[PDB]
Amino acid sequence: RESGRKVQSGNINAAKTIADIIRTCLGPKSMMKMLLDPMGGIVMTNDGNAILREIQVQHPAAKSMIEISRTQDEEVGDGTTSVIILAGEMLSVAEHFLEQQMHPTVVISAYRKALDDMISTLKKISIPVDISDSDMMLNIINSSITTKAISRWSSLACNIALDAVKMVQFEENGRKEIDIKKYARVEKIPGGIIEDSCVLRGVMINKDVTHPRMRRYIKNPRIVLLDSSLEYKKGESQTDIEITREEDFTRILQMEEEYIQQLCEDIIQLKPDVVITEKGISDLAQHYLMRANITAIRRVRKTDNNRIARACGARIVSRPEELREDDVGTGAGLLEIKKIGDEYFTFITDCKDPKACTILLRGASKEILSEVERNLQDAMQVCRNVLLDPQLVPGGGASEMAVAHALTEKSKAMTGVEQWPYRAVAQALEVIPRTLIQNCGASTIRLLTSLRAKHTQENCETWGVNGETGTLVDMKELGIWEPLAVKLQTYKTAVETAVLLLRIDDIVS
């Protein structure tokens, strides 16, 4: 239970102490944080991702800061640093002075217009990228893989992750938003070539579906996805009593297998040689498949068939009556059982609801595969964000100072009370030019004022400090891209978040 400044200064004691090493942990020159595990261990993290998990809670507001780092991790997976940075970077200056001006409130609506002038600043500096050209994305998409940096597959997996969210973009809500990712999924492939780590349609099933008898391939015959009751039903659609008598025993087995029959009267008509039964899978049920010349598929689940629903594009059958093709194994279908390494890979290509496409990732080993798998992430995430938002914006102090004086100019434009948060929020922008230089080792001061001067001339339009060169430069020059996607999404979060814990003047039970 906290109140007043004890919340507010405690809110400062929440995110900032989180965001302290994080700025060293952030930027392209990011300096990892050392951690000390409860075992006596160590974890070296540039992440705002891993720190909050391990580090124990230092303040109730931090538990709220953790989730907005989650929310940004949920939204992207990067910017988790900045959201707790930016919001916590807002908490230190404005509130207490403005509680001395007596308000959480004027700061909120200030934060809201501290939000918009950036959103006002962005549309110029955040300028449309062409999602058509891969390299026009790949410059953003190399900007995604360049900091986290697994360099070998930061090359190919991008073009893969480019194609990943591209091939998983049909996305139809009617508004053509592209959040669409899940269709794009990695594939854990033993052995094989380090290349042919690539995007294929549907979902080739690497999870639970690996069998000596699928035959070795089922191409034209269907993969049949059963939610439904492949096991017998003793009545019509239903079940009746067991055997206490000679009379009851013969009566039971008729409708039992007849249900399996009347299932596989309507199940066999659609031509599987592989029926994947996630539920209703049982010995006699799969033994029937064994006896039906249709592969008995066990140790398989909803994700599988939901991935197979995402693979051939099937709809996992919710009707015990009348199974068909477009139910399960849509199209002529391809179920391709390939051992690259010793795992049978269920390859189900030929996706219906097309543009739902996984990513076949093949290393010579899981690491060199996971090296594709991790580089894929930031790429495809930012690809998703670039395909979502077809814009890019210069990184570093460019967005920082162009909005900084803007908010400052806006603060002077207002010359009111809320100016003071604008005064506080504009500086929140500039800790990043600090952060970028607070990495490289020069004096950000000389450059801050010079980046002020970079605004004095150029309004820091495209000109930020680039963390790894530690100098104040055009990012359209350097091709360093935060998108209006990645940033505004990150900036949007913290804007709410600082308000949130500032909307807390009292913590209670």
Partner: protein, 514 residues
């Protein structure tokens, strides 16, 4: 709880030296063997930079990372773990001084890059191509053996080292995974490091010395049952009906006497003579009555020579693994010109040797089988990994710190870029390079600068690769001496340094993670 900035940074450079302070006493022939009765709780002895770490149970977090990076090195190398650990904290000293004079760890590491390059480039610039020859290989052998052990016992280990390296070259393997075989032997003296052109087998038999001397081997390495069992089991265990157990017990013995009489058929088919031995080797045990039936006929039936044997037997001897006796030819088995069942100490060690197409030529080490015999068991293996690299590379530079007065002094002469942004990491880098040449030189009671200035200038003057005499701490010429650094060895320890030296430099804060 947290430690901010320099605090977590102080923890970095703090733990690093005691490591090296072991190494200043652990490095080279100048270094000293370290008995650890504490480390794992075991009673131990070791010289190496990598091994002393893992032997300890280490409670310090900075040192939890430390046993990691020399591991992959000692895998390749066997030396330089006794060294790389030195350069890291010696680098952590500099890097500390520069943040002590103030700096970020980033603008520190920035100067490592070109400095690391120019030195890694100097690896190329110096690299001495040494035609890889048992003589030169003896030197690369003993230098790692001298590093870890007596130059005396180095040359004792060196032979069996340089023995099986040409013998693994005989297997067309530039690395060595086989004839890496180091066989402890029960003896009053560890002084004996020998070579067996074939295996050292485990159990001649529980009925011993069947045919103890086999000078022509027909080797059947068989996981079969001449011991199936003689004891009381029903389904293979104790069932609930006691009378039903011994019913199958005879057929268990009879299925042995199936395989036994098959050998009477087999030894006949194979040999027909005790002259050229048919050799049963069982991955399981063997009944003494199987042995008795076989031994009196001039057969040696070995039991429980391990799966490594079952391979190396099937391998080194040109042998086979045939899991049914039945009837087989001598050529259905491999051949070894000597199989001798040999007792020094308790166990009789059957030596299957002169093995045709040897895939394993065993390196015999006699001794008390203590940490002592292990102390000569690791250095050889470590020295093996060194000459393994010496087989791997065709280029081996001198040892004895001869490289850095050629390497560091050049980087001491010049920033690789000749600009100050490098100097911040070049001063740190080029400095840390000279620890190994200076440490044992100063460990010998010879001041580093006066010792270095010679070996430095003696390189500057003569263009010489100029070593240190590790025991006398004097400038030597390691190009001729034979203390020689594999291009494979020296390269990774640079990386192993750099890879572990950056993030820990770049981590200024530590906190309890749970």
């Amino acid at each position: 709880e947290v430690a901010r900035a320099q605090a977590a940074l102080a923890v970095n450079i703090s733990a690093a030296r005691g490591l090296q302070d072991v190494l200043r006493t652990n490095l080279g022939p100048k270094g000293t063997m370290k008995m650890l009765v504490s480390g794992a709780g075991d009673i131990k002895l070791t010289k190496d930079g990598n091994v002393l770490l893992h032997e300890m149970q280490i409670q310090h977090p900075t040192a939890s990372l430390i046993a990691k990076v020399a591991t992959a090195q000692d895998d390749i190398t066997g030396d330089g773990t006794t060294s790389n650990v030195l350069i890291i904290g010696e680098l952590l000293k500099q890097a500390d001084l520069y943040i002590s004079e103030g700096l970020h760890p980033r603008i520190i590491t920035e100067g490592f890059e070109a400095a690391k390059e120019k030195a890694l480039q100097f690896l190329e610039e110096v690299k001495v191509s040494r035609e890889m020859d048992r003589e030169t290989l003896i030197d690369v052998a003993r230098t790692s053996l001298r590093t870890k052990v007596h130059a005396e016992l180095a040359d004792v280990l060196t032979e069996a080292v340089v023995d099986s390296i040409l013998a693994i070259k005989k297997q067309d393997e530039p690395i060595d995974l086989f004839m890496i075989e180091i066989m402890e032997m029960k003896h009053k003296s560890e002084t004996d490091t020998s070579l067996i052109r074939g295996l050292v087998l485990d159990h001649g038999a529980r009925h011993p010395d069947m045919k103890k001397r086999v000078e022509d081997a027909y080797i059947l390495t068989c996981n079969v049952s001449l011991e199936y069992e003689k004891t009381e089991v029903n389904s293979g265990f104790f069932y609930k009906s006691a009378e039903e157990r011994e019913k199958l017990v005879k057929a268990e013995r009879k299925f042995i006497e199936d395989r036994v009489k098959k050998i009477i058929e087999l030894k006949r088919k194979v040999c027909g003579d005790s002259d050229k031995g048919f050799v049963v080797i069982n991955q399981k045990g063997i009944d003494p009555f199987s042995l008795d039936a076989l031994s009196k006929e001039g057969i040696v039936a070995l039991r429980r020579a391990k799966r490594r044997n079952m391979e190396r037997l099937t391998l080194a001897c040109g042998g086979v693994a045939l899991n049914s006796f039945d009837d087989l030819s001598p050529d259905c088995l491999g051949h070894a010109g000597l199989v001798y069942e040999y007792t020094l100490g308790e166990e009789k060690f059957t030596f299957i040797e002169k093995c045709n197409n040897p895939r394993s030529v065993t390196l015999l080490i006699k001794g008390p089988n203590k940490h002592t015999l292990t102390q000569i068991k690791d250095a050889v293996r470590d020295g093996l990994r060194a000459v393994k690299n010496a087989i791997d590379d065709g280029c081996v530079v001198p040892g004895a710190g001869a490289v850095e007065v050629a390497m560091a002094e050049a980087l001491i002469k010049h920033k690789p870029s000749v600009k100050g942004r490098a100097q911040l990491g070049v001063q740190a880098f080029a400095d840390a390079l000279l620890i190994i040449p200076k440490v044992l030189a100063q460990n010998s009671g010879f001041d580093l600068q006066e010792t270095l200035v010679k070996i430095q200038a003696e390189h500057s003057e003569s263009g010489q690769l100029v070593g240190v005499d590790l025991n006398t701490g004097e400038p030597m010429v390691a190009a001729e001496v034979g203390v020689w650094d594999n291009y494979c060895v020296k390269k990774q320890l640079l990386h192993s340094c750099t890879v572990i030296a950056t993030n820990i430099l770049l981590v200024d804060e530590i906190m309890r993670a749970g």
